[PDB]
Write a protein that binds this ligand. Structure first.
Ligand code: ESE
Ligand code: ESE
Lengths: 12, 238, 236, 9
């Protein structure tokens, strides 16, 4: 969904 | 959680180590600014900073939250976070805003964009305040974490999470106080300084709300192509 | 300055004594609400409250020491924050409702009458719940309201230092109150921070409310009093 | 300005 969602899950 | 088991010194270390990198602007300093040019640089910078801000995951206690709650806090606080970062690094540049090491803008360059000098003046005023208080790096990282956890905490079967966030917030308060005690401040001076720092967060909220409205107006006017990420962050406030 | 020589207990007394009365709205129970009539009620109320607020500010220690231009600025900056913290305070003992006036107690469903207002009601109600959870005391409330007056417009400005000395005094007062109430040293700084962080949320609600009020004005939904028009104007 | 006048009366 949200780009933010994707960024959070992919955080490094 | 581990966040609550951290000593004050361990909290400061964790926050210091979690600090995002200082990015450069694509700025080419052989070309005068235009309204579009200026907005482009600032928004491009903000978009790249946002990715790195998502730092958030390393803020003690944050990783404990649901993906939903993390999204909410970031959507609420992202511009406040960018702004306090900007004010912090501009501290030793009176009258200027250090957006990046290669993009140092004075007040009058705010006029390059309609309605922006008003925003610049507020950021500059906050910077002067930080300078006046001699704000320390250890205190800054504490304040920025408080913003992340506080700004959207009241916009929430899941009362256990909100209480966890409040326990983490209390720990950060303990950490600020610890730094002030270590710095040799008396009890009265500790409480006074703590109050002073937190009141600045009121002004940072104000600047964010104003900046959000300005960023929105520039969007509608199509005076600048905003990234998909930036548009979604902006959309969350409207 | 007399304000700085005030003890904590004298500070609290002065602030408690300067508290404005709870005013009634012009609510007419013979008629159903419309977007226009509800906006009329709330804005008529805010207007009468403003008059009392102006006179309350004159009694906040240190305020009258400022130039008229500075007093004007602080109030222009903080007026809606001040109205909102008052509303949240008197709504404390009414879970799920905002006690705008004794004869005007509204839940979020009644907020829906006005386009976009339920969002504001929700934020106010959330803040009210927070006060209730913290068991906010009246002495703490009056300190917080005075801090808002002095702080909100202080950075958009010697006198600056004077305002900060006064603000420091209010901090000392808050700590004094908490100690007197039996809070431990650690609990004192923790509660101080919790209370002050609320002010960030109050600022947020004021900015959102200001945009909404301006919106209603620009759609000719409700006529605002000349005073309210000028207070609103100061934010643009 | 009305506010300015009121802060005196
Ligand atoms: C481009 C704007 C000016 C500052 C900008 C910003 C960018 C990067 C930062 O690290 C801080 C701030 C955000 C927006 C907010 C208002 C204006 O549109
Ligand atoms: C009419 C509005 C609803 C709350 C209202 C208010 C009135 C009196 C109070 O004591 C507090 C608040 C002010 C405006 C702010 C947004 C909206 O337009």
């Amino acid at each position: 969904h949200k780009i933010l969602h994707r960024l959070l899950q992919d955080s490094s | 959680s581990l966040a609550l088991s951290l000593t004050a010194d361990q909290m400061v270390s964790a926050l210091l180590d979690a600090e995002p990198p200082i990015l450069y602007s694509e700025y080419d300093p052989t070309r005068p600014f235009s309204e579009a040019s200026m907005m482009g640089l600032l928004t491009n910078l903000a978009d790249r900073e946002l990715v790195h801000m998502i730092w958030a995951k390393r803020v003690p206690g944050f990783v404990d939250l649901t993906l939903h709650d993390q999204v909410h806090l970031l959507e609420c606080a992202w511009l406040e976070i960018l702004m306090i970062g900007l004010v912090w690094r501009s501290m030793e540049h009176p009258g200027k805003l250090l957006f990046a090491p290669n993009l140092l803008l004075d007040r009058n360059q705010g006029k390059c964009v309609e309605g922006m000098v008003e925003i610049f003046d507020m950021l500059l005023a906050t910077s002067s305040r930080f300078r006046m208080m001699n704000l320390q790096g250890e205190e800054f990282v504490c304040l920025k974490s408080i913003i992340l956890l506080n700004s959207g905490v009241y916009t929430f079967k899941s009362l256990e999470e909100k209480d966890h966030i409040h326990r983490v917030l209390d720990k950060i308060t303990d950490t600020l106080i610890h730094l002030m005690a270590k710095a040799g401040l008396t009890l009265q001076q500790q409480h006074q300084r703590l109050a002073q720092l937190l009141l600045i967060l009121s002004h940072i909220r104000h600047m964010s709300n104003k900046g959000m409205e300005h960023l929105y107006s520039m969007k509608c006017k199509n005076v600048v192509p905003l990234s998909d990420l930036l548009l979604e962050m902006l959309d969350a406030h409207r």
